[PDB]
Amino acid sequence: GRGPYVQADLAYAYEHITHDYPEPTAPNKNKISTVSDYFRNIRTRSVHPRVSVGYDFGGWRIAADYARYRKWNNNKYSVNIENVRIRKENGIRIDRKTENQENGTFHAVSSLGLSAIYDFQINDKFKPYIGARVAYGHVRHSIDSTKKTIEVTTVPSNAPNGAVTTYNTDPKTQNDYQSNSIRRVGLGVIAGVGFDITPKLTLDAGYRYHNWGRLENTRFKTHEASLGVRYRF
């Protein structure tokens, strides 16, 4: 046949705050005498499936990837609505001595994608499949204002010190941080198996793996693999 296509993918989101991570969002190790943690996982942003919507010709299709965007939702932070501390601090800080960790919104610019998939429809009850995913962003500014002149930038990083930069970025090895020709395009793979429940409804499971340099979102690793439902009208 042929017709409209929809896929909705769900996966378990682990919070990922108990292990080394190359972003300076939180400490790698040794969480004592440093800034207190946030509380903010009240399950509100993890319980709604991610969606890929498209059109399908015989199990051959192109679709567009939607849902689950940004780091934060609020544009007013005043009462501690979007981030609050999990407990008040005790003693004096020797680490993270300035204010609050997680300053501003950086690397959350990638926010849209397309996924292309081919079903191996040789069997009546199941389709093996292979396909490619592409991920990209939009800056959303889009402003009247002319560009700022100053754009030489080094930032703190929790990445291992391979070039001996002491927990900061190199002046030149800074692909995620550079003002012009920043890396924004991701490239991935969607491969797995679907099983037919009705000739319009498929239960579908497998990888939907994607690649990125630095992406910000508050540690969402959902969609690396998933279990989902997909319907073709």
Considering only CA atoms, give the Rg of the chain.
Answer: 21
3-state secondary structure of 125: coil
Q: Judge whether 79 and 26 are in contact, CB under 8 Å.
A: no
| Phi-psi group of 109: left, alpha or beta (phi > 0 → left; psi -120 to 50 → alpha; rest → beta) | alpha
**Separation CA 39–CA 4 (nearest Å):** 41
Count Cβ atoms within 10 A of the Cβ of residue 226 and give its class: 0-12 exposed, 13-18 middle, 19 or more buried.
buried
Q: Judge whether 147 and 180 are in contact, CB under 8 Å.
A: no
Instruction: Residue 129: name the closest of 45, 66, 195, 179 by CA.
Output: 195
Instruction: Residue 231: name the closest of 1, 39, 76 by CA.
Output: 1
Structure tokens at 190: 């969607």
Residue 200 is classified by DSSP as T
Instruction: Please count the CA atoms within 13 angstroms of the CA of 73 that sit on its side-chain side.
Output: 7
- The DSSP secondary structure of 57-119, one letter per residue, reads ETTEEEEEEES---S---S--TTSSS-EESS---S--SSS-SS-SS-S--S--EEEEEEEEEE
